[model samples]
Target: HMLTQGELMKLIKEIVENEDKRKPYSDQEIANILKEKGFKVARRTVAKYREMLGIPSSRERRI
Candidate 1:
């Protein structure tokens, strides 16, 4: 089954809000984290979600 909006929000929040801005997480890393949490999302989907949420790429996000 697909993740709910709340689940997606929580996951993105955990990644974007907590980690160091100097070294932001990559979409692949986010995907792996979601996979570990049993979300089963692809890296491509992770990228899409990141874009939709206005979470920039790691390079862009980096301080």
Candidate 2:
């Protein structure tokens, strides 16, 4: 039941590429978004992925 790094990266890439750019994603936002798509990821896990993706924090991305 383990995903390879490449496999994980591919999935993450798909999520990011398809994300709504007008709205920056928070951990909770990502969790909810993924949940809608049936991914079932937790908010904390989404936060980790956000870090890995180099996605800026809300404070950083804001105008």
Candidate 3:
């Protein structure tokens, strides 16, 4: 679908909010989650979101 900027921002906000609550999802994990949800996003895209959210990498997370 051709989502407008506002719609895209809303979706990004949702992803960011969830990621914040979850805190520190891996690029692969994010990709898998989006894939499961039918988004077809790639690991690199997940990494971009992770960076945008200022969250640490999965390896850096204090699990």
Candidate 4:
């Protein structure tokens, strides 16, 4: 079954909030994390969701 918007957002939120400031998570890494969590998402899909949530990219988020 496909994940709902809320489910995707929840996972993205956790990834963003828990990311390291010095080295934020990349879309690929986020996708890997989601895969481990049973989401099986692509890097592009994670990038899309990250954009949807207004979360900046890893480069932008890095400190």
How do all models score by TM-score? 0.74, 0.59, 0.52, 0.77
Stretches of candidate 3 above 4 Å error?
Answer: 1-25
Compose the digit string of candidate 1's lDDT tens values, residues 1-63: 287775655576576667777877787877777877678787877777778777767577575
Q: Which stretches of candidate 2 lie over 4 Å from their true place?
A: 1-20
Please give, for residues 1-63, the per-residue lDDT of candidate 2 as tens digits.
Answer: 133453333455466546655555567765676666446677767667667866667546654
| Worst 10 contiguous positions by lDDT, candidate 1 | 1-10
Give the Cα-based TM-score of candidate 1 against the true structure. Answer: 0.74
Give the higher-lDDT candidate: 2 or 4: 4
Q: For model 4, name the residue pairs that clash.
A: none
Candidate 4 lDDT over residue span 1-63, tens digit each: 277756666787676677676767788887877887778878877788878877877577575
Q: Which candidate model has the greater lDDT, 3 or 4?
A: 4
What is candidate 3's lDDT per residue for 1-63, written digit by digit as tens?
233433322344467455565465556765666666546667766566666755566455545
Clashes of 1: 0
Report the number of the highest-lDDT candidate: 4
A best-first ranking of the candidates according to their lDDT comes to: 4, 1, 2, 3
Higher-ranked by lDDT: 2 or 3:
2
lDDT of each: 0.72, 0.58, 0.56, 0.74
CA lDDT of 39 in candidate 4? 84
For each candidate in turn, give its C-alpha RMSD to the true structure in angstroms: 2.0, 3.3, 4.3, 1.8
